[PDB]
Symmetry: D2
C-alpha cells in the first residue's frame, strides 16, 4: 500500500516548476506517492516528472476530471471522441512514467449536471471507458472510476452504482475509486460501500467533509479505515485537500473551492501523512484482539 | 417550537390542488407546519393556502431559492432589482397568509457558481437583503438566510460566514437558517455552529446526508439535537427530503436529484415526524440526569 | 423479529404482582415481548406469567446472571452443580411458558471478578453450558450467551471470545447475545462484532451507554442497526434500561445502578419501542435505493 | 499543556528499576510527562524518581485509587483516617518531586461497590478531601477528582456530580479530572461535560473505550477534542492504557484487565503521543475556518 498526496495540496499549475515543487513537498511531507492531476495531459512535462520522481524516490499516479468538451457521457459522438482522446493521452503519460494507476471522474464530465443521465449517454460512457480500459490494460495500467457526489456527476454517485456500471463492462483492470468526502454525502455509511465494493475497490481518496484538515470535519474516518482493514485493502490511500490558498485555474472553480481551509500546506501535508499512517497502524492491531 | 415538513415532499407543483394536497398530507403525517416553496410567488394561490391551512389547523412558512435572472449577488443592477422584486412579493405572500417566517437562499442564486463571489456582488446582495428585511419587518415577518453548501452558493457556506454577513446589516428580524444536510459538508461539527449562531439561529432544516430517510446516512443528528437543546432553540424544525417522481423537472434538476431514496412519502413523512419529535423528547431528559 | 422490553423497566420484584404489572406495561408501551429476569427461577410464578401473557397476547423470554453460589466457572464442582441446577430450572420455566429463548450471563457469575478466569474453571463453564444447551434443545429452547463488559465477567467480554467458546461446544441451539451497552466498552466498533458473529447471533439488547433513554448517551446505534440489517438478523431485539427509580434488591446492586436516569417508565418505554421500530423501518429502506 | 503517559503503559512494579524504565520509555515515546500510579506512596522510591526525571527531562504527576482499607467515603472514621493518611503521603511525594498535580479516585475506594453511597459517607468523603486539598494548597499542589464509571465508584460518576461535590467545598486548588474511557459510559455526550465543567476541569485522561490503542474503539475523540479546544483547556492531557501484557499485581485486577490489547508498548506509546498531539494541532485550525 502506498500513502499518497494529491497535487493540489502544493500547486495549481503543473508546469516544470510545479512538478518539481509538488514532488519535493510531497516527499518532505512523508508521503510515498504523489497523484498528479492531469487536467491537460497533452502539455504535461513527463521528462521533468520522471526526473523529480527519481530524485525524491517517489511513486506516482494520475487523476483527471472531464468537462463539457470531453464528456464521454454525451450523446454527441464528437464530444465523446474528444474525451476518449484526452483519457488515452493521460494513460500514455502514466505508461511513460512507469506508473500503474489512473483514476478520477472519467465516466462523465465533472460538473453539476442540469439534467439526469440519458440512456444513450450512459451507453456511450461505458463503451468509451471500456475502450480506454482495454488500451490501458495492454499498457499494464489500472483504471479506477472515482465515485463522486450529485453535484459533480449524475452517473456514479454511490459504490453500488459503480458496481452495476462495471458489471456490464467486465474489464479486469477496471476498478472503483472511493473518496471519503463524496461518501460522506451519498453513502448510507462508511463500512457498507467498502464491503460491497471489496473486489473492485482499487483506489482510495482520504478527504474531510469540507476538504480541509483531517479530523476537523464530520467524516467518519474511524469506520472507514476499520472497514478497509476488514477487507484487507492493499491499494493506494491518497490524501486530498483543497483551499483557496492553492488555486488551479479550472479545477478549483469546478470543485467550488470558495473558502480558505488552510494557508500552510506544509503543516497540512505532514499532519495528513501522519493521520493516515497512524490510523492504518492502529487498525492493523484490531484483527489481533 | 413548530415541527414542520417541506411541501416538496408531497408535491412538485403548488397550484390549488397541490396546495390542498401538501397541506393535508403534512397534517396527516403529524406535523405542525408546512413550508411552501415560493419559487414563483406571483402565481401562488394565496387564498387556497389560507383556506387549507385553516381547515387543517396548520401553521405555514415559505422558502425559495433565487436563480440567474434574480441573483441579488450579481453585479448587474437589472438582475439585482429583479431578484429584490421576487423577494418582496414572497414577503407579501407570507404577510397575507399571516405567516411569520421567510427563509431559504435569498442572498444569491441557488446554483453551482463557476467563479468565486465578488466584492461588488456581495455588496449588492447585502444591500438588497437589508431592504427586503426592512420591508418584511414592517409586516412583522422574520427573514432567515439559509446556509448552503459550496455547490448551491458561493456566498454563505458556513454558520460563521452568515454571522459576519448579518453583523454588517444589523437587522433585528434578520436570522440564520441552518440545514443539517448542508452543515454535514461545510461545518467542523454539529455543535459548534449551533453554539456560535445561537443568538441569530431562527430556522432549522432537518435532512440526511443524502436527503433520504432520516437515520440512513452520515448526519450526526444526535450531536445536533443535543446542541439545539443546550441553547434552548425554540424556532421551527422542518423536515426536507426530495424525489424526482414528486418534484418538478426544474427543481429536481436544480437539487441534483438523480436517485430516489424513497417510494412512499406517507411512510417517510410519518417516520420523519416521529424521528424529530422523539429526538426532541429524548434530549429534554438530558438536563435532568 | 420480536421487539421486547426487559422487565426491570417496570419492576424489580417478579412476585405475582410484578409479573402481571410488567407484562401489562410492556403491552401498553407497544412491545411484542417481555424478558423476565429469572434471578430465582425456583420461586418464579409460572402460572401467573402464562395467564398474564395470554391476557395481553405477549411473547416471553428470560435472562439471568449467576452469582458466586452458582458460578459455573468455579473450580469447585459443588458450586458448578448448583449453577447448572439453577440454569436447568430456568430452561424448564421457559418450557412451561412455551418460550424459545433463554439468555444472559450463564457461563460465569455476573460480577466484578478480582482474578482472571482459570483453565479448569473455563472447562467447567463450557461443559455445564453444553449440558444446559442440550437439555434446552430437546425443549425447543435456544440458549444465547450474553457478552458483557469486564466488570460483569472475566470470561466472555467480546463477540470474538464468545465465538471461540461456542466453537468448542459445536451446539446448534447455542448462540450469542450482544448488548449495545456492553459492546460500547469492549468492542472495536458496532459493526465488526455483528458481521463476525452473524451465524451465531440470536439475541440483542438495546441499551444506551449509561443504560438510560435511547439516544441520550454515546452508543452508535446507527452503525449497529445498519450491520444488523446487512446480515438479515431476525432474532429478538430487546430494550434494556435501569434507573434508581426501579430497584431490584440484588440486580440493581450487581449492575451498579446508583443514579436516576429516568422517573417515568411509561414515557421511557413508549419512546424506546418507537426508537427501535423506527430505526428498523428506516434501515430496511437502504436496500433498494 | 503537558502531554503525558500513565506509568502502567511501561511497568506494573515501581521499584527503583521500574521507575527508571517507565521514565525512560515515556521520554523515548515523545511525551512531556509521566503519571506515577502511587498505590503505595509509603514505599515509593522518591530519590530514584527525581534522578530518572532529571536524566530524561520529564515532568511528573501522580494518581491513585483508594481501597477498602483507605475508603474516605466509609462511615468508619478509622477507615477514613487511614485513607486521608495515604492521601497526605501521596501529596508529600509530589512535593518532594516538585510536581503540581495530584489526581485519581481519592474520594472513595476504586472498586465495584455493592450498594449506593450514603449521606454520611459522602459527608466524610468531602471533609477528608477538603483537608487533603488544604494541605496540598500550602504545598502548591492541585488536587483533581477523577470522575469514574459505576463499577469503580458509587460517588462521582458524572462531571455534574463532581461539580456539585466541588461546589460545597469551594476550594481554589480543587478541580475535576475527566477520563474519556469513563465519559464514554456515563455521560450524555463528549462535549456537554467539557462545557459544563469548563472552569473546574484541571486534568484529562485519554483512554479508548476498551483501554487499548487510541482510535480502535468507540470513544468519540473528535467531539471531545473539539470541545476541549472550545473552552481553551490548558491542563495535562495524559494517555492511559492497560493490557494483560504488563500487569500490576493489585491494580490490574482492580481495573479488570482480563485481555491482551497490545504486546508492544513502544509502538503503543508513540502512537498515542502522536494521536493526542496531532489532534490538538488539527483542533487549533478550526477557529481559523
Ligand atoms: Mg477525490
Ligand atoms: Mg434546506
Ligand atoms: Mg443486557
Ligand atoms: Mg483514568
Amino acid at each position: 500500500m502506498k500513502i499518497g498526496c494529491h497535487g493540489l495540496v502544493w500547486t495549481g499549475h503543473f508546469d516544470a516548476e510545479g512538478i518539481r515543487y509538488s514532488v519535493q513537498k510531497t516527499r518532505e511531507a512523508g508521503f510515498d506517492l504523489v497523484e498528479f492531476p492531469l487536467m491537460d495531459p497533452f502539455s504535461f512535462d513527463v521528462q521533468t516528472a520522471k526526473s523529480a520522481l527519481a530524485e525524491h524516490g517517489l511513486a506516482a499516479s494520475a487523476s483527471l476530471g472531464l468537462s463539457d468538451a470531453t464528456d464521454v457521457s454525451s450523446e454527441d459522438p464528437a464530444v465523446v471522441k474528444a474525451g476518449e482522446e484526452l483519457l488515452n493521452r493521460a494513460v500514455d503519460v502514466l505508461a511513460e512514467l512507469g506508473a500503474t494507476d489512473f483514476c478520477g471522474v472519467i465516466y462523465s464530465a465533472m460538473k453539476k449536471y442540469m439534467e439526469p443521465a440519458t440512456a444513450a449517454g450512459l451507453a456511450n460512457s461505458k463503451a468509451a471507458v471500456g475502450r480506454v480500459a482495454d488500451r490501458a490494460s495492454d499498457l499494464g495500467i489500472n483504471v479506477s472510476l472515482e465515485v463522486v457526489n450529485r453535484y459533480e456527476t449524475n452517473v456514479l454517485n454511490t459504490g453500488r452504482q459503480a458496481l452495476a456500471y462495471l458489471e456490464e463492462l467486465n474489464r479486469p483492470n477496471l476498478g472503483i475509486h472511493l473518496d471519503t468526502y463524496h461518501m460522506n454525502i451519498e453513502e448510507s455509511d462508511m463500512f457498507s460501500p467498502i464491503l460491497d465494493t471489496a473486489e473492485a475497490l482499487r483506489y482510495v481518496h482520504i478527504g474531510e467533509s469540507h476538504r480541509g484538515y483531517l479530523g476537523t470535519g464530520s467524516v467518519d474516518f474511524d469506520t472507514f479505515f476499520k472497514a478497509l482493514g476488514r477487507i484487507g485493502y492493499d491499494g493506494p490511500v491518497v490524501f486530498e485537500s483543497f483551499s483557496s490558498s492553492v488555486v488551479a485555474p479550472d479545477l478549483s472553480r469546478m470543485l467550488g473551492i470558495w473558502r480558505n481551509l488552510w494557508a500552510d500546506n506544509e503543516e497540512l501535508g505532514a499532519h495528513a501523512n501522519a493521520f493516515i499512517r497512524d490510523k492504518l497502524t492502529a487498525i492493523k492491531t484490531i484483527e489481533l484482539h
